């Protein structure tokens, strides 16, 4: 029935998210300007992602138990999950009204063509939009949204993970917190198979991560493009 601890965890994650996600998107002004004219959107989105990586890291540090992991394991989980959590957290600005990420203003409203102008092909973009649509359809409570991002970050099967046993215990605690929350706090019919559908989204993310990595390597392949990214992005995305 959601123990004191599980309610504590949810409270920590909600505040953690509130401290790392500014719905006013005021900081977007610091990013190199978006250019909607080849790769004209790369500088702007690169900065957006670099900013987003910084936010995801801040969120992750506040995940109950994440601090108990080794420095190396913490690094491994962030490198592998960063793109996934950014895709997940972006659902908050994504709007089905026109299938775009609406970040406050027209300048900061991105659609398929903008992602296209960042160096990506439809093979990533379509399933990415598809993902956003399916996640939006779940109409998750904010409690479920933050729990899913935390569960994504603390995955024991990530390549390079060392104390896989420790990662699991941390994640299981967050999973059991989510499962129980859905039962006791998410009324039917919306709760129908909600947990299973959310886990399926993590599977979709693994697929998106894999395809993003391939197109990132093609893009970052040529120094002229790799030159337009940020140092944090270069370090995290390989």
């Amino acid at each position: 029935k959601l123990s004191e601890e599980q309610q504590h965890i949810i409270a920590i994650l909600l505040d953690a998210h509130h401290k790392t996600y500014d719905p006013t998107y005021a900081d977007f002004r610091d990013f190199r300007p978006p250019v909607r004219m080849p790769l004209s959107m790369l500088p702007h989105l690169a900065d957006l992602v670099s900013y987003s990586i910084q936010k995801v890291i801040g969120f992750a540090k506040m995940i109950p138990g994440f601090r108990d992991l080794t420095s190396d394991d913490q690094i491994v989980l962030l490198k592998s999950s960063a793109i996934e959590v950014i895709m997940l957290r972006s659902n908050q600005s994504f709007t089905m009204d026109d299938m775009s990420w609406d970040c406050g203003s027209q300048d900061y409203k991105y659609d398929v063509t903008d992602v296209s102008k960042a160096g990506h092909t439809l093979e990533l973009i379509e399933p990415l939009i598809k993902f956003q649509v399916g996640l939006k359809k779940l109409n998750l409570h904010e409690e479920e949204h933050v729990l899913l991002m935390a569960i994504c970050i603390v995955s024991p099967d990530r390549p390079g993970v060392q104390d896989a046993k420790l990662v699991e215990a941390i994640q299981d605690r967050l999973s059991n917190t989510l499962q129980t929350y859905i039962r006791c706090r998410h009324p039917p019919p919306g709760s129908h198979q909600l947990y299973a559908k959310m886990i399926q989204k993590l599977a979709d993310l693994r697929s998106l991560n894999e395809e993003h990595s391939k197109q990132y390597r093609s893009l970052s392949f040529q120094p002229e493009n790799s030159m337009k990214l940020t140092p944090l992005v270069l370090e995290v995305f390989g």
């Binding site: 910084q54 890291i57 801040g58 992750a60 540090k61 420095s71 913490q74 690094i75 962030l78 490198k79 140092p231 944090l232 370090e235 995290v236």
Partner: peptide, 10 residues
């Protein structure tokens, strides 16, 4: 060898 990421996690 992840300077920046590690610094941000400290």
């Amino acid at each position: 060898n992840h300077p920046m990421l590690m610094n941000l996690l400290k």
